[PDB]
Design a protein around this ligand. Structure first.
Ligand SMILES: OC[C@H]1O[C@H](OC[C@H]2O[C@H](OC[C@H]3O[C@H](O[C@]4(CO)O[C@H](CO)[C@@H](O)[C@@H]4O)[C@H](O)[C@@H](O)[C@@H]3O)[C@H](O)[C@@H](O)[C@H]2O)[C@H](O)[C@@H](O)[C@H]1O
Ligand SMILES: OC[C@H]1O[C@H](OC[C@H]2O[C@H](OC[C@H]3O[C@H](O[C@]4(CO)O[C@H](CO)[C@@H](O)[C@@H]4O)[C@H](O)[C@@H](O)[C@@H]3O)[C@H](O)[C@@H](O)[C@H]2O)[C@H](O)[C@@H](O)[C@H]1O
Lengths: 718, 718, 143, 146
């Protein structure tokens, strides 16, 4: 029996082998039929034991599997591992049956790529079963018709009479025949998230993971296998993106025979899951992309898929408003009068949205208290939230609010009433990060409280924007409402709760723009994008550092979700002094916004602020919804460049950046990509040059001095 | 509160920080005192939570530890992880006390590097403690006086009143300040063990491990951090060697802040350990070596340390006998008459030891039966063990035997008597590798049985040599004599059992040479070297393939234990045709031996073989106990070269190898290393060349044709 | 260097085929395959000498070397593979083809009818073999 | 006279120069290369075919240095040591993709295949008869074709 999935211009082929063994066959460019050219020569490998003594050529250590297990002759890292009551970890999944149907189903309490019409995707569910122990494992495969997308997840189910403990439950696993690849992941830190790191494969185990209860800044939930000569514009690329916002494991393993075991899912470290007879377990899905157009072709497939078939709400296809935030502007020292007097100026500038940041609730005068008491501070806001938001609305401005519902501070009224509502473990010191603690979302009561509490606050004023923040990673992980056996499920149940929490709140308010946040992109993952159509990219608002941040972030996530604000100089994070033009152009390459005190800006800068805003709305459709091409990498040199191309290839916008200036520098030229060569384009300020000329010859950049310069070009057909 | 350890020309520094926290400070070249030049600037790192709310600059995520834990603000991979009865994994280790005494102690039921005199080393034991659960962890540190050797291990003990479950118990952990290193491990397979692979570090986790219940050919228990510009003769090298023969994990992880956490110990995968109140668990040690003399300098301290302070018995410093094996010669088709008629010819050649291989016991006519019944087959050996061994003795040759006591075959009388004596799990198919099963060494009865049985077989004949084999990796790992809770200790208790059996047999018989074996070097680890002073390197007896194996193998393990035998052509593994000169030269570079059908060689080859034997006995003192220098790597080109130098640098032996012949090839030169420059040396057959010249200028190679060529040179002082 | 007549033949077959050795020292067995080699070349001589040439694997970059010849009308193709040094317990190798019509099927003699797209995008597996200096020949023709 | 030819079916541009003394004085050619082209950038690898007898034309790809790298023959023949062919290739260009600029010399004697990178990152690619130990006298009225 042969399973052949057609995903866009790609094919994912699988096959049943022997007595119900599931084997991998091929993943790559679209094929009409696999007649077995890649073949399958069986060999008796030394020290590779056999489940069938009559055949020495068959061993699980040497078989390409789709959902492999450890204990029975296979020694590579398994996709799953379960503990029985007798203590054994030996499992034997065999083929039971399978089903094929149009469309895409939702996963229980989990975010996933969706479909609006049956024609959009096709689903294959292969149900495997361990007859002896009565374990049922359902493998989910989905193939979109327009994109090279295969989404993979597994559903566990206890159909036996014994209790089962899940020690490992990864979302997917695939064995590549060879290992002649480089691998790309997105490491980083706070203020410098998601730097692109390409490394050659080592014979052994290399992996990216997070043990912080979040996708984290340190390791983004994404890995990708790339051909040795694959570049930014060409070459075969095999991407793996995890739709999950908690602990994850992105692991690649090369064995003795040069095969590459790529596995991805929830991090098995500090993780167990008890399955009582009758219960089931659903894993988040992993979106896999194949592409022959290099990293650009791969990213563009992720962009359209994530923007149109992962992002939700009414804003999924709507242009995002240019906003101004008061965080870096005023911090904690502010009041009602100080916010309203400048709102008039911002209206004249063309700003469409004003956002109130941290400091509006309880006694939020510092970062050491009041997290959890979501009541308006009469001290700075006499008329409160309702008075301010409605005052702003009649000025022609929308209103936005900042929240951090996942946090509880020691010095807070809710904590003195409920000290055991947080994530903690008995008789252990409750450590603090930024002097706050994380509440227990595994509880139904707190979730029902949190969904209800913030909803009334958000509905007590005409609000059209919400910024959900999270400035802490979980420590002393444990739950009081969970038994000693289950407790280790809290990390996942926390995420399951928040997924449920956001799902109800976002449903109650279809009129509100939701933007996830976590000290920047601490949870910039496909999981949060499903519930909130955009994310605050990075706390580092320096134009130069942002080049590295946005270029790396654009590898997986669409421009539409890429939050970018213009800040003041010298920057509060680095201290770098950059011009407002370049600082603008960098932020203009994402969801454009502002975050600085206008009262300290001069009329020259103030007038230029007017110039920037009016310019962006003309190209907002192009930047946020157009085809994105990366040209020059800031990771590979002194320059950085990218462009946006319209769907009909009639409009294009090009951005160029060079950081360090050198005296008597050589003349540079820039070759752009993705335009119609058979058409002519008019570059503003230069002339009408042929599209083919632009691709094959390129455009020369004007010689400039000074550090951190930028350039922008608008291209239109004739 | 400063721990300063001096090991030879190196220093290992530690410090107590605040309320009893153990921190790493420095490891490298010797310093008199660390007054804090490397310093320790504290910083408030974002998303790094604090156990002390008053100090935001204090976090376990940003401080270099010696034995870190997860759960309390540290998010990196911990050195250990304990499961409480309530299920939590949160531990809080604090400083209790410490003690310092001369010498080096032995580990409970475990092999370790030893000392013959008190003056050789000093040990520091730091007792750590978790007051709440009453858990005490004793950290062991050892400093040799003559070598740059650091061995580390930990002793766990439940000194509380509750039961504790070990999820992870690694032997050691060290946090490096920077990550500007390459990392080298020893991957491979059957027929190609321990290839040296150097790769640049990736930002995340890279690791080499084995889940096969053995050291395995796939991943050798050794990791090493090397400087980016470190070479074979110079540069800083940080080696990590594990004295263990079972499951292991050699993991290095670099975090967001460019620090390098090197951890090594028993593989936590498929491993748990129950500690009832009062009992203790001791982990094997990891020997770390520092060297500024490149890879050679690292190996040389490792070589003499392992031969003199790890290998045991009375043969530890004795010259190894030139042996001949009948495996590749006759395999299973042999009898008493067939060996004695050839015993006369082999006696004339100068062989010091003749070994009888697999096929002598039970019904070993195939490789699918008779494993476990260690009784002589009277049909193939009429006069039995007493008759045969005494027959060869009067010819002036010693006699040796092949055994695989850790094995049991389905087709054996021992299996029909005890079917539940093997590794198995309830109601699960018992998979076979090479049609055999692994015995349960976790059981005390099976251990007591095996020790007495094989010893008596070994005492039923005048035997002075034994080759212990292991030709299968464990499957369906579990034990019937262990409770549902402990079961996962089977992998470890097997090794504890195996360590005990060898411990008793090697003690009862100090007059017998023991050589470990496992389809080559499947267990070429310091653990086996402690009980058996040498190991059969690889089944691949091809001269060229062995060049790759031995060069990689010599990196960690001494030359004296490096088995090298001459085989027939075409080679039984690859099919490569090499000259007897070349086949000799490669085998002459290790523990010399023979393994081929003498009946098929012409008179010319027999006499040249005699010369090969005669040539080796002249230099066997030099190669096996001298200082070893690697010259040319077969991994870096078409050539391979190494040398042996006497302790007083008065005698030297040079070996050169070139694999592929090229027409009109350029003139090659070879520069030697490790000799005393102030003396002149006379090269046999050429002349007396200056010691300084051969090292700095080098020696020209004569041009010759044909593939797989070799040359050998003897150097002696004047 | 000592190489088999198959490989020494196959390598010479990648150009205008010819011989240069003492034939009197060759056995009759080698002589008959020699006749087969000559007959083999003239069948693809139009293809080899006038067809499109594709380099696959470089002997300068590793232990392998491979190339192929493709007809002008994309209906016929000939593939050559070479491996120099043999290693025990070697990993399975596969070969990705180029220059074929993906929308058409090809008949490789002795193997089967595989899709043209499959040959380029998935590639063809090589049988595990021992000994040094080996060679293989593949004939591809449309249907 | 600079000669340029463009084939219709192939991507072939052939370049050569024709010298002619149309004056009344005698002229000495110290160098008469066949062609020369200045590339705007020098972000390329360069491929030539060095070797020897019994090992002719091995492919050697090296990154460009800021200065002069060149392959030539002073043996009166194309020689086994350096084959009369050089090519500029993109950094990520392989056997199947990438922009490649090849330069082949139709000559069997002394040759010079030279690439020069200046201070401003431009690439001077020149090819023709090796000017070393080579001169050409042009009496009034005669001509020289390279
Ligand atoms: O609460 C609103 C805010 O929340 C998200 O980001 C918060 C993010 O940044 C924080 O830094 C602010 C602070 O940093 C500096 O101060 C210290 C030391 O004095 O530096 C440490 C960080 O490196 C920080 O812990 C210390 O406070 C700086 O001096 C000062 O000017 C700044 O005000 C904080 O570090 C961190 O925990 C995070 O919470 C969200 O991304 C924002 O949009 C916004 O909503
Ligand atoms: O018995 C003593 C022996 O034990 C150790 O080596 C065992 C190790 O190597 C074995 O190879 C010998 C075997 O190989 C061939 O057999 C097959 C097919 O016929 O080839 C496969 C190898 O990948 C093997 O699985 C098949 O049996 C071949 O016929 C012939 O050369 C030999 O009969 C065996 O292959 C493997 O399973 C392992 O068990 C120890 O290393 C030796 O020193 C020696 O003591």
């Amino acid at each position: 029996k042969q399973f052949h999935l057609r995903a866009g211009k790609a094919s994912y082929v699988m096959q049943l082998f022997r007595s119900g063994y599931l084997a991998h066959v091929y993943w790559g460019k679209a094929v009409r039929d696999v007649r077995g050219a890649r073949a399958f020569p069986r060999l008796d490998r030394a020290f590779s034991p056999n489940p069938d003594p009559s055949d020495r050529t068959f061993s699980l250590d040497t078989l390409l599997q789709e959902y492999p297990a450890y204990g029975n002759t296979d020694f590579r890292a398994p996709a799953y591992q379960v503990q029985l009551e007798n203590g054994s970890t030996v499992t034997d999944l065999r083929y039971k049956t399978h089903r094929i149907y149009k469309g895409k189903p939702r996963l229980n309490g989990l975010p996933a790529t969706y479909v609006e019409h049956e024609q959009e995707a096709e689903t294959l569910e292969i149900v495997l079963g361990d007859a002896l122990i009565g374990l049922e494992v359902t493998l989910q495969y989905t193939a979109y018709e327009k994109w090279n997308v295969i989404t993979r997840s597994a559903r566990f189910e206890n159909k036996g009479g014994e209790r089962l403990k899940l020690l490992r439950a990864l979302s997917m696993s695939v064995d590549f025949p060879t290992a002649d690849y480089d691998w790309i992941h997105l490491p980083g830190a706070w203020g410098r998230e998601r730097w692109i790191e390409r490394r050659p494969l080592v014979t052994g185990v290399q992996a990216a993971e997070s043990r912080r209860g979040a996708s984290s800044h340190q390791q983004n939930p994404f890995i990708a296998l790339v051909a040795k000569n694959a570049d930014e514009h060409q070459g075969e690329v095999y991407g793996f993106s995890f739709v999950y916002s908690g602990n994850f494991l992105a692991q690649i393993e090369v064995d003795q025979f040069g095969t590459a075991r790529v596995s991805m899912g929830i991090n098995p470290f500090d993780f167990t899951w008890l399955l009582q007879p009758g219960e089931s377990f659903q894993t988040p899905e992993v979106v896999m992309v194949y592409s022959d157009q290099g990293l650009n072709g791969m990213s563009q497939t992720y962009h359209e898929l994530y923007r149109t078939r992962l992002a939700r709400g009414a804003f999924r296809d709507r242009e995002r408003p240019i906003l101004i935030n008061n965080w870096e502007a005023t911090y904690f020292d502010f009041n009602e009068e100080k916010i309203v007097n400048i709102a008039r100026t911002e209206a004249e500038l063309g700003i469409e949205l004003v956002v109130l940041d941290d400091g509006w609730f309880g006694e939020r005068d510092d970062d050491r208290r009041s997290l959890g008491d979501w009541i308006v501070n009469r001290r700075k806001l006499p008329n409160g939230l309702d008075g301010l938001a409605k005052q702003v609305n009649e000025l022609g401005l929308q209103f936005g609010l900042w929240v951090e519902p996942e946090m509880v501070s020691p010095n807070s009224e809710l904590y003195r009433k409920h000290p055991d509502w947080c994530l903690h473990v008995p008789n252990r010191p409750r450590s603090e990060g930024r002097n706050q603690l994380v509440l227990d979302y595994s509880r139904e009561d707190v979730c029902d409280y949190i969904i209800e509490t913030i909803s009334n606050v958000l509905a007590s004023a005409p609000i059209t924007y919400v910024k959900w923040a999270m400035n802490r990673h979980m420590t002393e992980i444990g739950s009081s409402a969970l038994p000693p056996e289950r407790q280790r499920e809290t990390a996942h149940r926390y995420m399951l709760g928040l997924y449920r929490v956001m799902d109800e709140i976002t449903s109650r308010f279809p009129h509100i723009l939701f933007e996830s946040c976590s000290g920047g992109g601490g949870r910039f993952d496909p999981g949060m994008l499903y519930y909130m159509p955009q994310t605050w990219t990075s706390d580092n608002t320096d134009a130069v550092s942002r080049l590295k941040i946005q270029y790396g972030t654009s590898l997986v996530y669409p421009i539409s979700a890429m939050g970018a604000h213009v800040s003041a100089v010298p920057n509060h994070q680095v201290g770098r002094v950059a011009s407002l033009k370049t600082r603008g152009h960098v932020a203009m390459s994402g969801n454009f916004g502002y975050e600085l005190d206008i009262t300290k800006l001069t009329e020259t800068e103030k007038q230029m602020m007017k110039q920037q805003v009016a310019f962006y709305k003309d190209v907002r459709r192009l930047v946020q919804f157009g085809t994105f091409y990366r040209l020059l990498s800031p990771f590979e040199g002194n320059e950085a460049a990218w462009m946006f191309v319209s769907a009909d290839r009639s409009e294009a916008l090009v951005a160029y950046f060079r950081v360090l200036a050198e005296a008597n520098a050589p003349l540079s030229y820039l070759r752009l990509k993705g335009l119609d060569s058979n058409q002519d384009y008019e570059i503003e300020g230069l002339g009408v040059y042929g599209g083919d000329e632009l691709m094959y010859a390129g455009v020369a950049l004007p010689y400039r001095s000074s550090d951190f310069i930028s350039m922008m070009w608008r291209l239109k057909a004739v």
